[PDB]
Design an enzyme around this catalytic site. Structure first.
Site, PDB file in Angstrom:
ATOM      1  N   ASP A 167      -0.660   9.704  16.206  1.00 24.66           N
ATOM      2  CA  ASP A 167      -1.413   9.561  14.973  1.00 24.66           C
ATOM      3  C   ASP A 167      -2.175   8.256  15.022  1.00 24.66           C
ATOM      4  O   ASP A 167      -2.321   7.616  13.991  1.00 24.66           O
ATOM      5  CB  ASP A 167      -0.500   9.653  13.755  1.00 24.66           C
ATOM      6  CG  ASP A 167      -1.128   9.971  12.391  1.00 24.66           C
ATOM      7  OD1 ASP A 167      -1.998  10.899  12.331  1.00 24.66           O
ATOM      8  OD2 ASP A 167      -0.718   9.322  11.364  1.00 24.66           O
ATOM      9  N   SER A 188       1.311   8.757   2.941  1.00 24.57           N
ATOM     10  CA  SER A 188       1.920  10.068   2.778  1.00 24.57           C
ATOM     11  C   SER A 188       3.430   9.916   2.723  1.00 24.57           C
ATOM     12  O   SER A 188       4.105  10.644   1.989  1.00 24.57           O
ATOM     13  CB  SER A 188       1.618  11.000   3.913  1.00 24.57           C
ATOM     14  OG  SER A 188       0.363  10.740   4.511  1.00 24.57           O
ATOM     15  N   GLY A 239       0.814  -1.187   0.000  1.00 19.81           N
ATOM     16  CA  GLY A 239       0.000   0.000   0.000  1.00 19.81           C
ATOM     17  C   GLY A 239       0.857   1.250   0.000  1.00 19.81           C
ATOM     18  O   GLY A 239       2.067   1.179   0.208  1.00 19.81           O
TER      19      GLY A 239
HETATM   20  C1  LIG Z   1      -5.000   2.526   1.531  1.00 21.74           C
HETATM   21  N1  LIG Z   1      -3.859   1.677   1.878  1.00 21.74           N
HETATM   22  C2  LIG Z   1      -4.314   0.321   2.141  1.00 21.74           C
HETATM   23  C3  LIG Z   1      -3.197  -0.601   2.580  1.00 21.74           C
HETATM   24  N2  LIG Z   1      -2.096   0.021   3.351  1.00 21.74           N
HETATM   25  C4  LIG Z   1      -1.204  -0.825   4.060  1.00 21.74           C
HETATM   26  C5  LIG Z   1      -1.650  -1.943   4.778  1.00 21.74           C
HETATM   27  C6  LIG Z   1      -0.781  -2.780   5.450  1.00 21.74           C
HETATM   28  C7  LIG Z   1       0.578  -2.545   5.436  1.00 21.74           C
HETATM   29  C8  LIG Z   1       1.476  -3.501   6.111  1.00 21.74           C
HETATM   30  N3  LIG Z   1       1.216  -4.773   5.860  1.00 21.74           N
HETATM   31  C9  LIG Z   1       2.016  -5.696   6.432  1.00 21.74           C
HETATM   32  N4  LIG Z   1       3.075  -5.485   7.184  1.00 21.74           N
HETATM   33  C10 LIG Z   1       3.356  -4.163   7.468  1.00 21.74           C
HETATM   34  C11 LIG Z   1       4.441  -3.862   8.310  1.00 21.74           C
HETATM   35  C12 LIG Z   1       4.726  -2.569   8.613  1.00 21.74           C
HETATM   36  C13 LIG Z   1       3.938  -1.496   8.122  1.00 21.74           C
HETATM   37  C14 LIG Z   1       4.223  -0.087   8.504  1.00 21.74           C
HETATM   38  C15 LIG Z   1       3.529   0.951   7.924  1.00 21.74           C
HETATM   39  C16 LIG Z   1       3.812   2.246   8.286  1.00 21.74           C
HETATM   40  N5  LIG Z   1       4.710   2.576   9.218  1.00 21.74           N
HETATM   41  C17 LIG Z   1       5.358   1.555   9.827  1.00 21.74           C
HETATM   42  N6  LIG Z   1       6.229   1.897  10.775  1.00 21.74           N
HETATM   43  C18 LIG Z   1       5.125   0.221   9.511  1.00 21.74           C
HETATM   44  C19 LIG Z   1       2.895  -1.795   7.277  1.00 21.74           C
HETATM   45  C20 LIG Z   1       2.569  -3.111   6.947  1.00 21.74           C
HETATM   46  C21 LIG Z   1       1.061  -1.468   4.684  1.00 21.74           C
HETATM   47  C22 LIG Z   1       0.182  -0.654   4.004  1.00 21.74           C
HETATM   48  F1  LIG Z   1       0.705   0.383   3.281  1.00 21.74           F
HETATM   49  C23 LIG Z   1      -1.892   1.469   3.312  1.00 21.74           C
HETATM   50  C24 LIG Z   1      -3.182   2.201   3.059  1.00 21.74           C
END
Ligand SMILES: CN1CCN(c2ccc(-c3ncnc4ccc(-c5ccnc(N)c5)cc34)cc2F)CC1
Length: 339
Positions: A152, A34, A31
């Site tokens: 957040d 920002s 995904g």
């Molecule tokens: C609109 N979009 C839908 C999907 N989005 C999203 C969902 C899940 C993750 C994700 N999936 C699996 N493991 C992860 C591990 C770490 C992080 C993460 C995200 C942001 N900051 C930190 N520190 C860790 C995400 C996942 C990722 C995705 F982008 C985004 C919104």
């Protein structure tokens, strides 16, 4: 843009199958947000999947992510077994001029979970498991040597560990800060913004608890509790439900007159069509006596009047206007909603 690798938005353009530093095979794009992107990748060295957060190639997002790194590493000092429900950062590197944070692989976020309920909510039972975990995590954050305010919290930033269990973790510390560094203002995502921040007042770790209160309601009703289209709309929606903030807070609040004035009797009231203060009761939002949200849990086990009353009491304690009295993680875990 960056030798051909970046798009207009200063994101890395992903190509499935690409191999990085003869180590990570990028499977696919999970995904966007920002800060940039998160991709699914295989680490050939540790022989596991990782989620790699690829930060936009821009100073503002980079500087933000280095803060996230510092805090994540700090949290990982204390939590060596990963017990306290904070995503694990494995490592970080620069690559084609983008910072990349490497995380353990998790699953869907609670917003996506809510969208598969068609924004009608999940069970109080499941709401409670989320609650317990989330309160524990806030308790960990408030250990003195961390004193971290996530800043957040919302459903988007709370992920299941896997699709079958109720285990979760918090992600995304890019907007985060330790207690006392009060230079940020107009923080948190509007829907989850605490009165203190709305009012321009000093804030502490209790702002997360305000966010959490909002989140747990939303997890059960399926819907944001306080869906402001701006700060005025937001403070007004809070006041619908909880009434005029206490006078001793408004007296001290730099932004008080963004939403309130005084009547001739000298008491605070709103400026400007909404339901009168405190008449949009949480009792009816939750449907305590009326079969739960929209009456849809009528008869269903674990959704008794008694149960809804425990839950309501927890929430109102998290949505305390006063950051001093607002319930603290530890006592939130001692709440009868979790007995
Ligand atoms: C609109 N979009 C839908 C999907 N989005 C999203 C969902 C899940 C993750 C994700 N999936 C699996 N493991 C992860 C591990 C770490 C992080 C993460 C995200 C942001 N900051 C930190 N520190 C860790 C995400 C996942 C990722 C995705 F982008 C985004 C919104």
């Amino acid at each position: 843009y960056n030798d051909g690798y970046d798009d207009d938005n200063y994101d890395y353009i992903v190509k499935n199958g690409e191999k990085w530093m003869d180590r990570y095979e990028i499977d696919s794009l999970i995904g966007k947000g920002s800060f940039g992107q998160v991709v699914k990748a295989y680490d050939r060295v540790e022989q596991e999947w990782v989620a790699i957060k690829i930060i936009k190639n821009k100073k503002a997002f980079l500087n933000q992510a280095q803060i996230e790194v510092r805090l994540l590493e700090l949290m990982n000092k204390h939590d060596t077994e990963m017990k306290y429900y904070i995503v694990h950062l494995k490592r970080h590197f620069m690559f084609r001029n983008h910072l990349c944070l490497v995380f353990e692989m998790l699953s869907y976020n609670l917003y996506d979970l809510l969208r598969n309920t068609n924004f009608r909510g999940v069970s109080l039972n499941l709401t409670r498991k989320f609650a317990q975990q989330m309160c524990t995590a806030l308790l960990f954050l408030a250990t003195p040597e961390l004193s971290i305010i996530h800043c957040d919290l919302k459903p988007e930033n709370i992920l299941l560990c896997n699709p079958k269990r109720s285990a979760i973790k918090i992600v995304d510390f890019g907007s985060s800060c330790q207690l006392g560094q009060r230079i940020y203002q107009y923080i948190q995502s509007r829907f989850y913004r605490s009165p203190e921040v709305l009012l321009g007042m000093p804030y502490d770790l209790a702002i997360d608890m305000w966010s959490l209160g909002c989140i747990l309601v939303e997890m059960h009703t399926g819907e944001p509790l306080f869906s402001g289209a701006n700060e005025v709309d937001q403070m007004n929606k809070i006041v619908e439900v909880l009434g005029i903030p206490p006078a001793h807070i408004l007296d001290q609040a730099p932004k008080a007159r963004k939403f309130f004035e005084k009547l001739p009797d000298g008491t605070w009231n709103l400026k400007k069509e909404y339901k009168p203060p405190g008449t949009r009761k949480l009792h009816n939002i939750l449907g305590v006596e009326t079969g739960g949200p929209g009456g849809r849990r009528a008869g269903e086990s674990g959704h008794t009047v008694a149960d809804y009353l425990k839950f309501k009491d927890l929430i109102l304690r998290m949505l305390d206007y006063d950051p001093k009295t607002r319930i603290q993680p530890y006592y939130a875990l001692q709440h009868s909603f979790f007995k």
